[PDB]
Amino acid sequence: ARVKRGVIARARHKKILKQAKGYYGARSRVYRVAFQAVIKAGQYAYRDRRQRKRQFRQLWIARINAAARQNGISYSKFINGLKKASVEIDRKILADIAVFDKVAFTALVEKAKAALA
Amino acid sequence: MRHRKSGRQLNRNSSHRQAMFRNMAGSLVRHEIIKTTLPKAKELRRVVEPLITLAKTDSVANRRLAFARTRDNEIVAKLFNELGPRFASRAGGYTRILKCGFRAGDNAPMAYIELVDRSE
Amino acid sequence: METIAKHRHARSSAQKVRLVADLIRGKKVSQALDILTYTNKKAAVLVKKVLESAIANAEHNDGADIDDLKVTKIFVDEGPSMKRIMPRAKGRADRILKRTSHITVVVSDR
Amino acid sequence: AVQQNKPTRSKRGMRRSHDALTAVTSLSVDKTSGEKHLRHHITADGYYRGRKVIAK
RNA sequence: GUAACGGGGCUAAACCAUGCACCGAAGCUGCGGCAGCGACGCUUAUGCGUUGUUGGGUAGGGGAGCGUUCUGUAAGCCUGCGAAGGUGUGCUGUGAGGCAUGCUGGAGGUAUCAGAAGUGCGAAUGCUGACAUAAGUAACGAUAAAGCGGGUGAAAAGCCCGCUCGCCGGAAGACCAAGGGUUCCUGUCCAACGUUAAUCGGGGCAGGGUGAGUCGACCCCUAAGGCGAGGCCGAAAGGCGU
RNA sequence: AGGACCGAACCGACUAAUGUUGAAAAAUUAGCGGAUGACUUGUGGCUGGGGGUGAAAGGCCAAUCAAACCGGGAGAUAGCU
RNA sequence: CCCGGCGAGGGGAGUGAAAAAGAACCUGAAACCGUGUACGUACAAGCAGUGGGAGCACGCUUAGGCGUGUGACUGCGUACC
RNA sequence: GGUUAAGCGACUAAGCGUACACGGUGGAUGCCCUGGCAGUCAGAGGCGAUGAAGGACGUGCUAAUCUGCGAUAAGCGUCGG
């Protein structure tokens, strides 16, 4: 029983093309070349799903260091004071507080200094 | 480099170019008007105008030289008989060039070259 | 108002007629007419014929007063290509593509 | 003497950008006949600088 | 081309001893989601109030699944108030996929469970058709050479006529032999060809044109050589030859 | 008289240049050797594949020759890509 | 009927369910070639992607983002068999 | 409000990239076939010197092809449907 595969091939090609839509040059026009992009795009997405956590941690650490140095204390000393005071707040909320409300961050820093000293 | 040199080549050798100029000058002076490409008329001025300059004067040797140039007994007869007196009072500028667009065959600059005459 | 006009199966190539089309793209009817008339291209007359057809269609089949008309949409497109075999050196055979182009002119008052 | 890889339509269009022509934009109207003609060229009918030059 | 800290740059931002802090992975921990393995309290062709553990992977081995043609189900069902294909969208499943619909289409398709594959393409210097690339680049096919005027025509350098310039002229002239089969002439057209246009052509359509006792073929004879009545030879075919 | 001499047609390609997706699947310009004999050519045949021919190079046998082309064994076989 | 060259083609009219069913004629996708729209781009280097990401252009309930296109800049990132 | 200076700073697209709408080359997918492949049921397994198969030339009102036919030439005669 001869079976024609044109419909299935076209469906798969359209799926790949719609996945690859938005790329530059032939990467969004040629299925043979667009297929490589979608696999590479998936690999990049898989890597970035992990890289994003560490990059946001980096940004939050930088923001906390900036705020602490502006207030008159180093990031390491501030974190040590928080740990000695038994504060479980994380870098994300710490950075949000530092960015928006300065008085709250001043309270955090002074409590950390009191715990340290 | 062609610094100050004069004389177009027209994609032709010396013999072909001189023959072309001779024939074109003969036809131009025979018919009082011809149609030719603008470079051809520009290079043909320097040939035709001295013919009229020479024809201004009349003598046996002048007639012989005017025949040797343009190699046409009828043309030389027309010269010294009608081309002389009709321009005896004109010093230079015996020819006029009017651009008339481009040839359809190959899009070449076309222009009509004619004497300053024909005010009948 | 569309008043479309086209000349399918034109001998001139689209790549060489787009150059002429761009000159008149978005200009007034009279300006385009004179530009095409005095343009030194075969495509110039080829598209001037189409422009004349379009303006005649506007005059007859549609509203009069061609004075307030502009060439809004004009575009040149390739057409069917004819295969020709040209002998070459060493017995090699290459294929000559006699390219034809479709030219469309749309003229509207607004 | 041959290409290692196929150039792209973007580069092709960039190269062809300079191939576009320029309109004359110098239509001159005859003083007498009021006809459009190329500057320093005779009209189609044969009128130049008002006076006739072709007599045909 | 500095090029033997990565660079900036550093006299501590260089090396030894110690300490307290922090950054530091897909490692661990916290949460949620999925699948396999063994247990016990129970469900008993299956959930688990559970428990511990496993889940990187090529060749390879095992298991479970998605897609299409056709057959039974199926003379049942959807379908001209719109089937199949095409084309975008929103949901949905760890997935091959599935569902509905905007527009084209126009009359076929097919639920669930089973049966067989010519059953899934991204490569094999793969095959067929088309389109790009180079690129609007080389080239436009002996360096014997065209110009002007008039004519037709929408358009003239190449089409027709006239005057000039040039080439072959033991040929680039005229007859034939062999070889082609109407390309020869006229009227008519620029659909396709002429390496460009063409009104022109050895291009498209129609018509006309080839007259032999003395030309040649045909015919009589024949060389080289072929066939070959009988005849000789050879497994057959067939080879020689009067 | 000359398997004579110089030199046309004719035969061949010894040198240089161009041409290597060229005008041409070995060509064109000028030089170059023979040009009355072992010369050449038109026509018609004979010698057919482990065979023909070969002034003999492993040369030619329809642009293919240390064994032509066409169809079959044959989808030969490939421990190879 | 008109433009056009007593052409080709096209535009009107009519036939036809349908003429983007017009003989280059069922359904009519891709590589490839343009037009218009919105964005970005002429001091910025490399598999041209991914995560973040300001702004701009389109509609929404509410008046804040949400659906799509674009996306400067930034960490990482040397195609497939 | 004006003169001068410093800082910051959009508006440009010859062309190009993305997404959308509209176009074209293109004959892929979908549907149909008087076209092919393999079998079962039966016949027959030959045609021809009272001139076989296969062909040339002719054969209509018609310039040409297919089909049938042969100067009685898309044909003629007898008997049946």
JSON list of N, CA, C and O (backbone and C1' of nucleotides) in Angstrom, two decimals, chain E residues 85-87 104-106 122-123 130-132 154 190-191, chain G residues 5-7 17-18 26-33 80-81:
[
{"chain": "E", "resi": 85, "resn": "G", "atom": "P", "xyz": [-6.91, 17.64, 5.06]},
{"chain": "E", "resi": 85, "resn": "G", "atom": "O5'", "xyz": [-6.18, 18.42, 3.88]},
{"chain": "E", "resi": 85, "resn": "G", "atom": "C5'", "xyz": [-5.33, 17.73, 2.97]},
{"chain": "E", "resi": 85, "resn": "G", "atom": "C4'", "xyz": [-4.92, 18.62, 1.83]},
{"chain": "E", "resi": 85, "resn": "G", "atom": "C3'", "xyz": [-4.18, 19.90, 2.21]},
{"chain": "E", "resi": 85, "resn": "G", "atom": "O3'", "xyz": [-2.81, 19.70, 2.49]},
{"chain": "E", "resi": 85, "resn": "G", "atom": "C1'", "xyz": [-5.88, 20.42, 0.68]},
{"chain": "E", "resi": 86, "resn": "G", "atom": "P", "xyz": [-2.07, 20.66, 3.55]},
{"chain": "E", "resi": 86, "resn": "G", "atom": "O5'", "xyz": [-2.34, 22.13, 2.99]},
{"chain": "E", "resi": 86, "resn": "G", "atom": "C5'", "xyz": [-1.74, 22.55, 1.78]},
{"chain": "E", "resi": 86, "resn": "G", "atom": "C4'", "xyz": [-2.10, 23.98, 1.44]},
{"chain": "E", "resi": 86, "resn": "G", "atom": "C3'", "xyz": [-1.74, 25.04, 2.46]},
{"chain": "E", "resi": 86, "resn": "G", "atom": "O3'", "xyz": [-0.37, 25.38, 2.46]},
{"chain": "E", "resi": 86, "resn": "G", "atom": "C1'", "xyz": [-3.93, 25.43, 1.67]},
{"chain": "E", "resi": 87, "resn": "U", "atom": "P", "xyz": [0.38, 25.68, 3.85]},
{"chain": "E", "resi": 87, "resn": "U", "atom": "O5'", "xyz": [-0.31, 27.03, 4.37]},
{"chain": "E", "resi": 87, "resn": "U", "atom": "C5'", "xyz": [-0.24, 28.22, 3.60]},
{"chain": "E", "resi": 87, "resn": "U", "atom": "C4'", "xyz": [-1.17, 29.28, 4.13]},
{"chain": "E", "resi": 87, "resn": "U", "atom": "C3'", "xyz": [-0.93, 29.75, 5.56]},
{"chain": "E", "resi": 87, "resn": "U", "atom": "O3'", "xyz": [0.15, 30.66, 5.68]},
{"chain": "E", "resi": 87, "resn": "U", "atom": "C1'", "xyz": [-3.23, 29.37, 5.23]},
{"chain": "E", "resi": 104, "resn": "U", "atom": "P", "xyz": [-13.94, 33.04, 1.37]},
{"chain": "E", "resi": 104, "resn": "U", "atom": "O5'", "xyz": [-12.71, 32.34, 0.64]},
{"chain": "E", "resi": 104, "resn": "U", "atom": "C5'", "xyz": [-11.98, 33.01, -0.38]},
{"chain": "E", "resi": 104, "resn": "U", "atom": "C4'", "xyz": [-11.01, 32.07, -1.06]},
{"chain": "E", "resi": 104, "resn": "U", "atom": "C3'", "xyz": [-11.62, 30.80, -1.63]},
{"chain": "E", "resi": 104, "resn": "U", "atom": "O3'", "xyz": [-12.14, 31.01, -2.93]},
{"chain": "E", "resi": 104, "resn": "U", "atom": "C1'", "xyz": [-9.66, 30.28, -0.38]},
{"chain": "E", "resi": 105, "resn": "G", "atom": "P", "xyz": [-13.60, 30.47, -3.33]},
{"chain": "E", "resi": 105, "resn": "G", "atom": "O5'", "xyz": [-13.36, 28.94, -3.71]},
{"chain": "E", "resi": 105, "resn": "G", "atom": "C5'", "xyz": [-12.22, 28.53, -4.45]},
{"chain": "E", "resi": 105, "resn": "G", "atom": "C4'", "xyz": [-11.86, 27.10, -4.13]},
{"chain": "E", "resi": 105, "resn": "G", "atom": "C3'", "xyz": [-13.03, 26.13, -4.11]},
{"chain": "E", "resi": 105, "resn": "G", "atom": "O3'", "xyz": [-13.30, 25.61, -5.40]},
{"chain": "E", "resi": 105, "resn": "G", "atom": "C1'", "xyz": [-11.76, 25.88, -2.12]},
{"chain": "E", "resi": 106, "resn": "G", "atom": "P", "xyz": [-14.32, 26.35, -6.40]},
{"chain": "E", "resi": 106, "resn": "G", "atom": "O5'", "xyz": [-15.09, 25.14, -7.10]},
{"chain": "E", "resi": 106, "resn": "G", "atom": "C5'", "xyz": [-14.42, 23.91, -7.37]},
{"chain": "E", "resi": 106, "resn": "G", "atom": "C4'", "xyz": [-14.64, 22.91, -6.27]},
{"chain": "E", "resi": 106, "resn": "G", "atom": "C3'", "xyz": [-16.04, 22.32, -6.18]},
{"chain": "E", "resi": 106, "resn": "G", "atom": "O3'", "xyz": [-16.23, 21.23, -7.07]},
{"chain": "E", "resi": 106, "resn": "G", "atom": "C1'", "xyz": [-15.35, 23.05, -4.04]},
{"chain": "E", "resi": 122, "resn": "G", "atom": "P", "xyz": [13.85, 16.57, 6.64]},
{"chain": "E", "resi": 122, "resn": "G", "atom": "O5'", "xyz": [15.21, 17.34, 6.34]},
{"chain": "E", "resi": 122, "resn": "G", "atom": "C5'", "xyz": [15.70, 17.47, 5.01]},
{"chain": "E", "resi": 122, "resn": "G", "atom": "C4'", "xyz": [17.07, 16.86, 4.86]},
{"chain": "E", "resi": 122, "resn": "G", "atom": "C3'", "xyz": [17.13, 15.35, 5.05]},
{"chain": "E", "resi": 122, "resn": "G", "atom": "O3'", "xyz": [18.12, 14.79, 4.19]},
{"chain": "E", "resi": 122, "resn": "G", "atom": "C1'", "xyz": [18.48, 16.42, 6.69]},
{"chain": "E", "resi": 123, "resn": "A", "atom": "P", "xyz": [17.69, 14.29, 2.72]},
{"chain": "E", "resi": 123, "resn": "A", "atom": "O5'", "xyz": [18.96, 14.61, 1.82]},
{"chain": "E", "resi": 123, "resn": "A", "atom": "C5'", "xyz": [20.13, 13.80, 1.89]},
{"chain": "E", "resi": 123, "resn": "A", "atom": "C4'", "xyz": [21.37, 14.64, 2.08]},
{"chain": "E", "resi": 123, "resn": "A", "atom": "C3'", "xyz": [22.69, 13.86, 2.00]},
{"chain": "E", "resi": 123, "resn": "A", "atom": "O3'", "xyz": [23.70, 14.68, 1.41]},
{"chain": "E", "resi": 123, "resn": "A", "atom": "C1'", "xyz": [22.49, 14.87, 4.13]},
{"chain": "E", "resi": 130, "resn": "A", "atom": "P", "xyz": [12.67, 23.07, -15.55]},
{"chain": "E", "resi": 130, "resn": "A", "atom": "O5'", "xyz": [12.30, 24.05, -14.36]},
{"chain": "E", "resi": 130, "resn": "A", "atom": "C5'", "xyz": [11.01, 24.64, -14.27]},
{"chain": "E", "resi": 130, "resn": "A", "atom": "C4'", "xyz": [10.81, 25.36, -12.96]},
{"chain": "E", "resi": 130, "resn": "A", "atom": "C3'", "xyz": [11.82, 26.45, -12.66]},
{"chain": "E", "resi": 130, "resn": "A", "atom": "O3'", "xyz": [11.50, 27.68, -13.30]},
{"chain": "E", "resi": 130, "resn": "A", "atom": "C1'", "xyz": [11.56, 25.07, -10.76]},
{"chain": "E", "resi": 131, "resn": "C", "atom": "P", "xyz": [12.66, 28.72, -13.67]},
{"chain": "E", "resi": 131, "resn": "C", "atom": "O5'", "xyz": [13.04, 29.38, -12.28]},
{"chain": "E", "resi": 131, "resn": "C", "atom": "C5'", "xyz": [12.06, 30.07, -11.51]},
{"chain": "E", "resi": 131, "resn": "C", "atom": "C4'", "xyz": [12.58, 30.39, -10.13]},
{"chain": "E", "resi": 131, "resn": "C", "atom": "C3'", "xyz": [13.87, 31.19, -10.08]},
{"chain": "E", "resi": 131, "resn": "C", "atom": "O3'", "xyz": [13.66, 32.58, -10.26]},
{"chain": "E", "resi": 131, "resn": "C", "atom": "C1'", "xyz": [14.03, 29.35, -8.60]},
{"chain": "E", "resi": 132, "resn": "A", "atom": "P", "xyz": [14.91, 33.55, -10.58]},
{"chain": "E", "resi": 132, "resn": "A", "atom": "O5'", "xyz": [15.60, 33.76, -9.16]},
{"chain": "E", "resi": 132, "resn": "A", "atom": "C5'", "xyz": [16.90, 34.30, -9.06]},
{"chain": "E", "resi": 132, "resn": "A", "atom": "C4'", "xyz": [17.48, 34.07, -7.68]},
{"chain": "E", "resi": 132, "resn": "A", "atom": "C3'", "xyz": [18.96, 34.36, -7.53]},
{"chain": "E", "resi": 132, "resn": "A", "atom": "O3'", "xyz": [19.22, 35.74, -7.32]},
{"chain": "E", "resi": 132, "resn": "A", "atom": "C1'", "xyz": [18.43, 32.28, -6.51]},
{"chain": "E", "resi": 154, "resn": "A", "atom": "P", "xyz": [2.50, 53.09, -39.06]},
{"chain": "E", "resi": 154, "resn": "A", "atom": "O5'", "xyz": [3.51, 54.16, -38.44]},
{"chain": "E", "resi": 154, "resn": "A", "atom": "C5'", "xyz": [3.05, 55.21, -37.60]},
{"chain": "E", "resi": 154, "resn": "A", "atom": "C4'", "xyz": [3.83, 55.26, -36.32]},
{"chain": "E", "resi": 154, "resn": "A", "atom": "C3'", "xyz": [5.32, 54.99, -36.44]},
{"chain": "E", "resi": 154, "resn": "A", "atom": "O3'", "xyz": [6.05, 56.15, -36.80]},
{"chain": "E", "resi": 154, "resn": "A", "atom": "C1'", "xyz": [4.42, 53.69, -34.68]},
{"chain": "E", "resi": 190, "resn": "C", "atom": "P", "xyz": [3.68, 43.55, -38.24]},
{"chain": "E", "resi": 190, "resn": "C", "atom": "O5'", "xyz": [4.45, 42.67, -37.17]},
{"chain": "E", "resi": 190, "resn": "C", "atom": "C5'", "xyz": [3.86, 42.37, -35.91]},
{"chain": "E", "resi": 190, "resn": "C", "atom": "C4'", "xyz": [4.58, 41.26, -35.18]},
{"chain": "E", "resi": 190, "resn": "C", "atom": "C3'", "xyz": [5.71, 41.71, -34.26]},
{"chain": "E", "resi": 190, "resn": "C", "atom": "O3'", "xyz": [5.76, 40.86, -33.11]},
{"chain": "E", "resi": 190, "resn": "C", "atom": "C1'", "xyz": [6.56, 40.24, -35.91]},
{"chain": "E", "resi": 191, "resn": "A", "atom": "P", "xyz": [4.69, 41.05, -31.93]},
{"chain": "E", "resi": 191, "resn": "A", "atom": "O5'", "xyz": [4.05, 39.60, -31.74]},
{"chain": "E", "resi": 191, "resn": "A", "atom": "C5'", "xyz": [4.88, 38.46, -31.63]},
{"chain": "E", "resi": 191, "resn": "A", "atom": "C4'", "xyz": [4.18, 37.31, -30.95]},
{"chain": "E", "resi": 191, "resn": "A", "atom": "C3'", "xyz": [5.09, 36.21, -30.43]},
{"chain": "E", "resi": 191, "resn": "A", "atom": "O3'", "xyz": [5.66, 36.49, -29.16]},
{"chain": "E", "resi": 191, "resn": "A", "atom": "C1'", "xyz": [3.39, 35.24, -31.72]},
{"chain": "G", "resi": 5, "resn": "G", "atom": "P", "xyz": [0.98, 52.99, -30.04]},
{"chain": "G", "resi": 5, "resn": "G", "atom": "O5'", "xyz": [0.30, 52.30, -31.31]},
{"chain": "G", "resi": 5, "resn": "G", "atom": "C5'", "xyz": [0.31, 52.94, -32.58]},
{"chain": "G", "resi": 5, "resn": "G", "atom": "C4'", "xyz": [0.45, 51.93, -33.70]},
{"chain": "G", "resi": 5, "resn": "G", "atom": "C3'", "xyz": [-0.70, 50.94, -33.82]},
{"chain": "G", "resi": 5, "resn": "G", "atom": "O3'", "xyz": [-0.85, 50.54, -35.18]},
{"chain": "G", "resi": 5, "resn": "G", "atom": "C1'", "xyz": [1.29, 49.78, -33.31]},
{"chain": "G", "resi": 6, "resn": "C", "atom": "P", "xyz": [-2.12, 51.03, -36.04]},
{"chain": "G", "resi": 6, "resn": "C", "atom": "O5'", "xyz": [-3.27, 50.00, -35.67]},
{"chain": "G", "resi": 6, "resn": "C", "atom": "C5'", "xyz": [-3.22, 48.65, -36.13]},
{"chain": "G", "resi": 6, "resn": "C", "atom": "C4'", "xyz": [-4.61, 48.06, -36.28]},
{"chain": "G", "resi": 6, "resn": "C", "atom": "C3'", "xyz": [-4.67, 46.54, -36.35]},
{"chain": "G", "resi": 6, "resn": "C", "atom": "O3'", "xyz": [-5.87, 46.08, -35.73]},
{"chain": "G", "resi": 6, "resn": "C", "atom": "C1'", "xyz": [-5.56, 47.45, -38.33]},
{"chain": "G", "resi": 7, "resn": "G", "atom": "P", "xyz": [-5.86, 44.80, -34.75]},
{"chain": "G", "resi": 7, "resn": "G", "atom": "O5'", "xyz": [-4.32, 44.48, -34.51]},
{"chain": "G", "resi": 7, "resn": "G", "atom": "C5'", "xyz": [-3.89, 43.87, -33.30]},
{"chain": "G", "resi": 7, "resn": "G", "atom": "C4'", "xyz": [-2.53, 43.24, -33.44]},
{"chain": "G", "resi": 7, "resn": "G", "atom": "C3'", "xyz": [-2.07, 42.40, -32.25]},
{"chain": "G", "resi": 7, "resn": "G", "atom": "O3'", "xyz": [-2.58, 41.08, -32.29]},
{"chain": "G", "resi": 7, "resn": "G", "atom": "C1'", "xyz": [-0.33, 43.88, -32.89]},
{"chain": "G", "resi": 17, "resn": "A", "atom": "P", "xyz": [-24.48, 29.70, -13.87]},
{"chain": "G", "resi": 17, "resn": "A", "atom": "O5'", "xyz": [-23.82, 30.67, -12.78]},
{"chain": "G", "resi": 17, "resn": "A", "atom": "C5'", "xyz": [-24.61, 31.30, -11.78]},
{"chain": "G", "resi": 17, "resn": "A", "atom": "C4'", "xyz": [-23.91, 31.29, -10.45]},
{"chain": "G", "resi": 17, "resn": "A", "atom": "C3'", "xyz": [-22.45, 31.72, -10.46]},
{"chain": "G", "resi": 17, "resn": "A", "atom": "O3'", "xyz": [-22.29, 33.12, -10.39]},
{"chain": "G", "resi": 17, "resn": "A", "atom": "C1'", "xyz": [-22.69, 29.70, -9.24]},
{"chain": "G", "resi": 18, "resn": "A", "atom": "P", "xyz": [-21.59, 33.93, -11.59]},
{"chain": "G", "resi": 18, "resn": "A", "atom": "O5'", "xyz": [-20.06, 34.01, -11.15]},
{"chain": "G", "resi": 18, "resn": "A", "atom": "C5'", "xyz": [-19.69, 34.45, -9.85]},
{"chain": "G", "resi": 18, "resn": "A", "atom": "C4'", "xyz": [-18.56, 33.62, -9.29]},
{"chain": "G", "resi": 18, "resn": "A", "atom": "C3'", "xyz": [-17.28, 33.62, -10.11]},
{"chain": "G", "resi": 18, "resn": "A", "atom": "O3'", "xyz": [-16.46, 34.75, -9.86]},
{"chain": "G", "resi": 18, "resn": "A", "atom": "C1'", "xyz": [-17.86, 31.40, -9.58]},
{"chain": "G", "resi": 26, "resn": "C", "atom": "P", "xyz": [-6.75, 25.13, -14.14]},
{"chain": "G", "resi": 26, "resn": "C", "atom": "O5'", "xyz": [-7.77, 24.87, -12.94]},
{"chain": "G", "resi": 26, "resn": "C", "atom": "C5'", "xyz": [-9.16, 25.07, -13.10]},
{"chain": "G", "resi": 26, "resn": "C", "atom": "C4'", "xyz": [-9.94, 24.43, -11.98]},
{"chain": "G", "resi": 26, "resn": "C", "atom": "C3'", "xyz": [-9.40, 24.67, -10.58]},
{"chain": "G", "resi": 26, "resn": "C", "atom": "O3'", "xyz": [-9.78, 25.92, -10.04]},
{"chain": "G", "resi": 26, "resn": "C", "atom": "C1'", "xyz": [-9.91, 22.37, -10.85]},
{"chain": "G", "resi": 27, "resn": "U", "atom": "P", "xyz": [-8.73, 26.79, -9.18]},
{"chain": "G", "resi": 27, "resn": "U", "atom": "O5'", "xyz": [-8.54, 25.94, -7.85]},
{"chain": "G", "resi": 27, "resn": "U", "atom": "C5'", "xyz": [-9.61, 25.76, -6.94]},
{"chain": "G", "resi": 27, "resn": "U", "atom": "C4'", "xyz": [-9.21, 24.88, -5.77]},
{"chain": "G", "resi": 27, "resn": "U", "atom": "C3'", "xyz": [-7.92, 25.27, -5.07]},
{"chain": "G", "resi": 27, "resn": "U", "atom": "O3'", "xyz": [-8.09, 26.32, -4.14]},
{"chain": "G", "resi": 27, "resn": "U", "atom": "C1'", "xyz": [-7.93, 22.94, -5.50]},
{"chain": "G", "resi": 28, "resn": "G", "atom": "P", "xyz": [-7.57, 27.80, -4.47]},
{"chain": "G", "resi": 28, "resn": "G", "atom": "O5'", "xyz": [-5.99, 27.64, -4.54]},
{"chain": "G", "resi": 28, "resn": "G", "atom": "C5'", "xyz": [-5.29, 26.88, -3.56]},
{"chain": "G", "resi": 28, "resn": "G", "atom": "C4'", "xyz": [-3.83, 26.72, -3.92]},
{"chain": "G", "resi": 28, "resn": "G", "atom": "C3'", "xyz": [-3.12, 28.02, -4.27]},
{"chain": "G", "resi": 28, "resn": "G", "atom": "O3'", "xyz": [-1.78, 28.01, -3.78]},
{"chain": "G", "resi": 28, "resn": "G", "atom": "C1'", "xyz": [-3.00, 26.53, -6.10]},
{"chain": "G", "resi": 29, "resn": "A", "atom": "P", "xyz": [-1.11, 29.37, -3.24]},
{"chain": "G", "resi": 29, "resn": "A", "atom": "O5'", "xyz": [0.02, 28.88, -2.23]},
{"chain": "G", "resi": 29, "resn": "A", "atom": "C5'", "xyz": [-0.26, 28.68, -0.85]},
{"chain": "G", "resi": 29, "resn": "A", "atom": "C4'", "xyz": [0.77, 27.79, -0.21]},
{"chain": "G", "resi": 29, "resn": "A", "atom": "C3'", "xyz": [2.22, 28.16, -0.50]},
{"chain": "G", "resi": 29, "resn": "A", "atom": "O3'", "xyz": [2.71, 29.15, 0.39]},
{"chain": "G", "resi": 29, "resn": "A", "atom": "C1'", "xyz": [1.90, 25.86, -0.93]},
{"chain": "G", "resi": 30, "resn": "A", "atom": "P", "xyz": [3.82, 30.21, -0.09]},
{"chain": "G", "resi": 30, "resn": "A", "atom": "O5'", "xyz": [5.18, 29.38, -0.04]},
{"chain": "G", "resi": 30, "resn": "A", "atom": "C5'", "xyz": [5.66, 28.81, 1.17]},
{"chain": "G", "resi": 30, "resn": "A", "atom": "C4'", "xyz": [6.86, 27.94, 0.93]},
{"chain": "G", "resi": 30, "resn": "A", "atom": "C3'", "xyz": [7.98, 28.59, 0.12]},
{"chain": "G", "resi": 30, "resn": "A", "atom": "O3'", "xyz": [8.84, 29.36, 0.93]},
{"chain": "G", "resi": 30, "resn": "A", "atom": "C1'", "xyz": [7.48, 26.46, -0.78]},
{"chain": "G", "resi": 31, "resn": "A", "atom": "P", "xyz": [9.29, 30.84, 0.49]},
{"chain": "G", "resi": 31, "resn": "A", "atom": "O5'", "xyz": [10.79, 30.65, -0.01]},
{"chain": "G", "resi": 31, "resn": "A", "atom": "C5'", "xyz": [11.70, 29.82, 0.70]},
{"chain": "G", "resi": 31, "resn": "A", "atom": "C4'", "xyz": [12.60, 29.07, -0.25]},
{"chain": "G", "resi": 31, "resn": "A", "atom": "C3'", "xyz": [13.35, 29.94, -1.26]},
{"chain": "G", "resi": 31, "resn": "A", "atom": "O3'", "xyz": [14.52, 30.51, -0.72]},
{"chain": "G", "resi": 31, "resn": "A", "atom": "C1'", "xyz": [12.34, 28.12, -2.37]},
{"chain": "G", "resi": 32, "resn": "C", "atom": "P", "xyz": [14.58, 32.09, -0.44]},
{"chain": "G", "resi": 32, "resn": "C", "atom": "O5'", "xyz": [14.31, 32.74, -1.87]},
{"chain": "G", "resi": 32, "resn": "C", "atom": "C5'", "xyz": [15.17, 32.45, -2.97]},
{"chain": "G", "resi": 32, "resn": "C", "atom": "C4'", "xyz": [14.67, 33.09, -4.24]},
{"chain": "G", "resi": 32, "resn": "C", "atom": "C3'", "xyz": [14.22, 34.54, -4.13]},
{"chain": "G", "resi": 32, "resn": "C", "atom": "O3'", "xyz": [15.30, 35.46, -4.12]},
{"chain": "G", "resi": 32, "resn": "C", "atom": "C1'", "xyz": [12.63, 33.31, -5.37]},
{"chain": "G", "resi": 33, "resn": "C", "atom": "P", "xyz": [15.14, 36.88, -3.39]},
{"chain": "G", "resi": 33, "resn": "C", "atom": "O5'", "xyz": [14.25, 37.73, -4.40]},
{"chain": "G", "resi": 33, "resn": "C", "atom": "C5'", "xyz": [14.66, 37.93, -5.74]},
{"chain": "G", "resi": 33, "resn": "C", "atom": "C4'", "xyz": [13.54, 38.47, -6.59]},
{"chain": "G", "resi": 33, "resn": "C", "atom": "C3'", "xyz": [12.94, 39.79, -6.14]},
{"chain": "G", "resi": 33, "resn": "C", "atom": "O3'", "xyz": [13.72, 40.91, -6.54]},
{"chain": "G", "resi": 33, "resn": "C", "atom": "C1'", "xyz": [11.20, 38.27, -6.67]},
{"chain": "G", "resi": 80, "resn": "C", "atom": "P", "xyz": [26.39, 21.98, 15.64]},
{"chain": "G", "resi": 80, "resn": "C", "atom": "O5'", "xyz": [25.53, 21.30, 14.48]},
{"chain": "G", "resi": 80, "resn": "C", "atom": "C5'", "xyz": [24.16, 21.00, 14.67]},
{"chain": "G", "resi": 80, "resn": "C", "atom": "C4'", "xyz": [23.60, 20.20, 13.52]},
{"chain": "G", "resi": 80, "resn": "C", "atom": "C3'", "xyz": [24.25, 18.85, 13.25]},
{"chain": "G", "resi": 80, "resn": "C", "atom": "O3'", "xyz": [23.80, 17.82, 14.11]},
{"chain": "G", "resi": 80, "resn": "C", "atom": "C1'", "xyz": [24.05, 20.03, 11.22]},
{"chain": "G", "resi": 81, "resn": "C", "atom": "P", "xyz": [24.73, 16.55, 14.42]},
{"chain": "G", "resi": 81, "resn": "C", "atom": "O5'", "xyz": [24.85, 15.80, 13.01]},
{"chain": "G", "resi": 81, "resn": "C", "atom": "C5'", "xyz": [23.82, 14.94, 12.56]},
{"chain": "G", "resi": 81, "resn": "C", "atom": "C4'", "xyz": [24.23, 14.17, 11.33]},
{"chain": "G", "resi": 81, "resn": "C", "atom": "C3'", "xyz": [25.45, 13.28, 11.47]},
{"chain": "G", "resi": 81, "resn": "C", "atom": "O3'", "xyz": [25.16, 12.03, 12.09]},
{"chain": "G", "resi": 81, "resn": "C", "atom": "C1'", "xyz": [25.64, 14.53, 9.48]}
]
